[PDB]
Structures are given as structure tokens and as C-alpha cells.
Design a protein around this ligand. Sequence first.
Ligand code: PLA
Ligand code: PLA
Lengths: 401, 401
Amino acid sequence: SSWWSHVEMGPPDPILGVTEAFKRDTNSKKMNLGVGAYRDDNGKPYVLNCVRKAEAMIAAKKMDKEYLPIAGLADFTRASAELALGENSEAFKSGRYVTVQGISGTGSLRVGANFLQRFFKFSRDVYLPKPSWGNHTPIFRDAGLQLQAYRYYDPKTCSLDFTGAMEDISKIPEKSIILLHACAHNPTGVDPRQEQWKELASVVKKRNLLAYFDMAYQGFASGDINRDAWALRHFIEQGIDVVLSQSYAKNMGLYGERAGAFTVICRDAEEAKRVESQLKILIRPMYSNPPMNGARIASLILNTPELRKEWLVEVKGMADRIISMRTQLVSNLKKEGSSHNWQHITDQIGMFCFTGLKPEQVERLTKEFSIYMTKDGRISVAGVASSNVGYLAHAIHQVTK
Amino acid sequence: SSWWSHVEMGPPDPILGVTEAFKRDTNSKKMNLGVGAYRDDNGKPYVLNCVRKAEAMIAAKKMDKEYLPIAGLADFTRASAELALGENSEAFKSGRYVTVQGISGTGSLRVGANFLQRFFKFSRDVYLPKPSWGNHTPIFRDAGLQLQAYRYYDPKTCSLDFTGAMEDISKIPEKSIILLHACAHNPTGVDPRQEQWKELASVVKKRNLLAYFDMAYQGFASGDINRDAWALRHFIEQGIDVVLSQSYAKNMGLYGERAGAFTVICRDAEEAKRVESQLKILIRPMYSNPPMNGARIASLILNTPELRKEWLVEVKGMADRIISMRTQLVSNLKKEGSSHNWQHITDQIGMFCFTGLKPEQVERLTKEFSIYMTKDGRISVAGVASSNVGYLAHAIHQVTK
Ligand SMILES: Cc1ncc(COP(=O)(O)O)c(CN[C@@](C)(CC(=O)O)C(=O)O)c1O
Ligand SMILES: Cc1ncc(COP(=O)(O)O)c(CN[C@@](C)(CC(=O)O)C(=O)O)c1O
């Protein structure tokens, strides 16, 4: 008997653990369709051109490695709020906001919750869609907040259950926290329509709840970053002071570098200064200050007219590609002879596809086809190549035949 | 009344906030000697040569930016452990340890604090030395632990109060936690001498305390890495299963990059595997995975023979230079006519000087000389330049006259 004898072995991550299990498979035809990591048409990681360019300038400017402020890189931060909010935003213009650099999306979401457990006097509950990204549960629970749920998807229909959502939401106690996916919901691949959003904003505004936005995919729903912040902006413009988390891990391909942020919309700029000091007090004892490499890069790209230009054209490129993957998939499905309707493949948006497959099926994929996915039927359509789509379609078809 | 009306204004950080205040001083003669960051002789940041080289390799290698495992870059993680434990180390040759990449020493420290709060079922108390680095308090507290203290420095003599330490130490309830700075005790600069250290070990082992070592300055206390970890290694050799955080921020100047780790010393490798399992689960909903640049760099260096050579050498030169500043600083104070005994400056080791100055002096230093330092009297001797030690001498003296 020592110190950690009583420590159990916990199981691998639902999402991240799949990469592990993949990594160990010997088959030449493996497919990593678990984590949402974008592949090129060659089946290779893709590091944006504007990111490669961005580095080079960093390299060439012979930059120091001194410590950032608790809050991050002022140019990154500001540009982040601006990307989310928009330049003509009142929010932004009056600077009634506070942006804090963070360890990518997760790091932001966490910091946010931490902030919430401290300061959000009103409630301890956080409502999340049914379903939602695996990770949101732990993040919030570990932060010391309660979790709840609101209806969201209809597996029967392979679409949004707006009637249900509305019921639920409408019954959420006043001043509670409600998590909303800004765009390209994970893992569904379905977002409310502009009209439905307007509705939610009504209810949310009426019942006076807290709207926490998780935006890990700006530009990946529509391929437009603007279009993509529509709902988040509307809410703001409707008068609802939201809090939000942003990740550049995917839209800018800075997965490993960890560039993200956490934002709080306040009444006044004073309020902001205040909320800021608290968040610094909160981060410091968590990791002191944030990683500088990705922030620099992003900072550089958002703030340089020519890289921001190049950036958008590259973002559209990846969505387009994901698009061409859904398509071709569905096609290879029919050509394999699939009896079933795979419409939801092309109708869903984002990186994934929530196909409806059952567990043995997933099992089957892995085991016979060395096709990696989450046990929920969710594949990562972005990790598919022109070179492997027929195989997957094959495999999906057989295990489903 | 809004959501955040009750959010008060929080104070600036006792260490990091200084850097803020300096930033806003226009005096052409300002000196920031608050946080422990190394400057060259010209009073400028120093990017290790070895680091510029590793950089350029990562570059020419054309690497991806894909997510790193939840526990980090294996190669960095391995090297860290080896650096700390030594290559002949049983604990290391047998694999009874678990290192995980963290967000610098601070993150590392927090993860271990979180793990402890979770799995250390025998005690909630954390014993810190008097005095200790300011951030230790909050990290421990924010994690759900209780803080306690033990005697350490005796300001009347400007040295370790080994007597009281042993006393205190000897009375600590069994199975409690004991924080020990591996070397270059921040902010004191007074470390136990080997023999004393032998005597601490015995009391630690006898009362059965869990020893958590803070290892942020390897190679800054003696210029020697191995000699610097003597204590740590001794502890473990006597069979004391420690927990430990490590930073490469200083020692490799990767401040901003956020590069460190947290190691748990297990009974066996199985135990070790279990513990890790739990670590990941603890880290996943915090930040998901850690930031890759710092680790690529430290890894490339720690593992590429020539780079190691180079690195070590650069560590000597930095330690050497600090020493000369101390020496020069003391002399200048005499050349200016100081009556007081400044021996301590030279006696102390590491990055700072715990000069004894009282609050009002610190004030004057700020106000009239625009000389920045923590209010405890702590100046960072690593931040003095050939070109300003004079000035400093001058100022310290006038305020002291
Ligand atoms: C809804 C959602 N929020 C936040 C994040 C934060 O990720 P970050 O910390 O790396 O920026 C992701 C990433 N989701 C991925 C693609 C990866 C992951 O699980 O972390 C996923 O596979 O679902 C996400 O899908
Ligand atoms: C004892 C000790 N531990 C851990 C750290 C953490 O540094 P890291 O989180 O970047 O890896 C520091 C840093 N001490 C500094 C240099 C910086 C600080 O206050 O955070 C100091 O000024 O004392 C330290 O002095």
C-alpha cells in the first residue's frame, strides 16, 4: 500500500481515445474518422498557406519569447472579438466587451465556466442540447456546475426537433445558463434556420437566461465567417449579453498550437474592465499566462489585409471540399447499391455526419475495415479523401447491407 | 441591474501586475526587476541560441499542427523525466513514473494540485515554506486544498532557519503534503545545503509526508543541472515517491511558449499506467491537449546531442552573468558609500535578491527612480544590465541612506 494504490484505471476518451486506438492498427487502409481534424484530398494534414506565411514573418522578425499578459496578446484578442462580433457592431464599437486569450476552445470554455461558477450568482445549472459535444459535460461539471438538457435532434427525422426544443427551453427557469452551438452543431450537423433562431432569441430574451455560445467552427457551416456569426450577432443586437468561446483550431488549422478566446458582453466598458480583472485573477492560478505561438499567427492573419484575404479563400476551400465529400459519398453509396436513404449525409453541415449507424456497425467498421469513428454513429467527413471515399462507402454499405 | 453588476474590481497581481505598471512609465531610465526574466547584458531579452536552432529545424521539417495526445509529446515528456531524475535512476529505468506535459510550471503545478484534490485521500493540507512564491497559495486554494506553513527563512540573519523548519516539519501530521522548492528558493535564494537536505528527507520519510517538489530553476542555482536536482533525486533514492512540477521557461527562456510538466512517482509501472489514465481524464476538460511549440523545442534540444551541449553551456553563462551583477551591485553600493551590509546579495543564488527593503523604499524606488520590483523587497538580479547596475546602486543607496 502506497499513495496511489486505490487509483483505478479510467477509460479512454470517447473522441480523443479513438486517435489512440487508430495509431496502433497495422492495416494500410485505416481511416481516422473520429476527431474532427481536417484532411486534404490526399488524406494529409493541411497547414494553411496563410499560416505558413504567418510563421515566416514571425521567424524573420526575430521575436522574443517573453511572457504574454495574463489575458493574452492584445492584437489577437481584439481581433478575435472583432471576428466574432463584426466591425460595425455596437458591442464592439462601444467596447462593452471583454476578450481573454485562452487555451483554444476548451481552455476558453473552461475558463468561462470557472468564471460562471464564481460569479454567476443566479443558477448552477447549465442546459445543453440533446445531444451535445461529449466534452461539454465534464468541462462544466468539473467546473462545479450542474448539468441539464434541452431537446435538440430527432433521430427519427434526422433533423432538428424545434417543437421539443421550444418546449424545453420555454420551461427553463429564469436566469439559468443555456449552451447554444453558434453554428454547425457537434455532433448533429444541423443548426436552427434564421427564423428559428429569431424565435430562440425571443424565448431566451423573455425568460432571461444566460446564453453561452460555443463557436468552434466559424466558417465551416457556410464557408462564410460572417454568415456563420449570424445568430450570435442577432442575439447581441436583440439585447442579449452573451458570453462566448472561440477556437481557431479548425478554421485556421491551429489544432496543436492552441489558439482561442473567451468573451463576455457587459453593459458598460467600465463593467468590462471589472470583469476583466476578475478573469485575470482566475487564470493566473491556472496556468499563469497563455501560449504565444498560435496567437501570434492568428493575430498576424486577422490583422493583415492580405492574409485575412487569403485566409477566407482557404476556409471556403475546405468546406467546399467537405461538401464534395458528402456528395461523392452518397453517390458511392447508391453505386454500391445501398437500399437506404443517405440524404442526411449531404444535408448536414460541418465536418461531420451523424449517420445513425449502431454500435456493432461502428464495431464492424473498425474491426473489418479499420475505419475509425465514435460510437455514436458520427464520422468525420473532413478526413475523407477522393482516394478513400469509395472504400468507406463500401464499408458503410457492407456492414449495413 | 445586469449579470455582472456585483463583479468588483480585483487587484493587480503582486508579481505580474508590476510588469503592467512598468509598461506605463515613460521615464527613459525605467527598470523592470519584478518578474524573474532574464535579460542579456544590454538589458535585452535573450533567445537561447540552441532555441533558435531547434526552431529552424521544426521549420525546415515542415511539420503539421495536429492535436498532440492529451498527455503531450511523448519525446518531450520522456526527456523531462530523464532530465529531472537522471538517466541511471531506478525510478527512471524501471519506468515507475508518469510525466505529463503541462502548461509550464504553473499549469503543471495546477494539474498536480487538481489530482491531489481528487485522489489524495489522506490529507487536504498543503504545507508551504515561509515565505514561498506568491502563486503557490492561490493555485492550491483554487484547487480545493487547504494551506499550511513551515518556517524557512529568518530575515534577521538572511538565511535558512533550519532549526524552526525541522521543528515545524517534524510536527506535521502524517500523510500531509509538503511543498519543497527543488533549488533556488523563490523569493529567498537560500537553499538547504546537501547535509541539511539529508536531514529533511529523514523527517519527511519518518512522518510519511507526500513531497511535492517545485522545480522551476534547474541549472540556475549552480549553473549545473545535475547538481541542481541533487535533492530531488536524493529524496527518491531514499524511496520517497514525490510529485513534481517542472518549468523550462527560465532555463530555456521559453517563457511564453508554456513548456513544463508534472511527474508522479509510482510504485511500479502498472500503477504508473493507472495514474496517467486519471491524469488525462483530468486534463481533457481543462484544455483538452497542450500547446506544441514549446514542447517541440525543448524536445529537440533535450534530445539532440549537440543542442544539449550548447544548451548547458548557455545555462552556465546566464548563471555566471547573474553572479557578476550581484558582485558588481554590491561593489557599486560601496563605491556610493553604503554603510549597510550587502553580503546577502552575493550570498543568495538564483534569479533574485531578497534585499530586505521595506515598503516605503520600494515606493521611492518606483516613484523617483522608476525602479520596479515586488513589494516584498524582491529584485530580479537577472534583469540588471552592465549598463544600469550603477544606477540601481545609486538608487538603492539614496533610498537607504
Ligand atoms: C463543439 C466544440 N467545442 C469546442 C471544441 C474545442 O476544441 P479545441 O480545444 O481544440 O479548440 C470542439 C472541437 N471538437 C473536436 C473536433 C476535437 C475535440 O474533441 O476536442 C471533435 O472531435 O469533436 C468542438 O467540436
Ligand atoms: C517557484 C516558481 N514556480 C513556478 C513558476 C511558474 O512559471 P511558469 O508558470 O511560467 O512555468 C515560477 C515563476 N516565477 C516567476 C518567474 C514568474 C511568475 O511570477 O509567475 C517570478 O517572477 O517569480 C516560480 O518562481
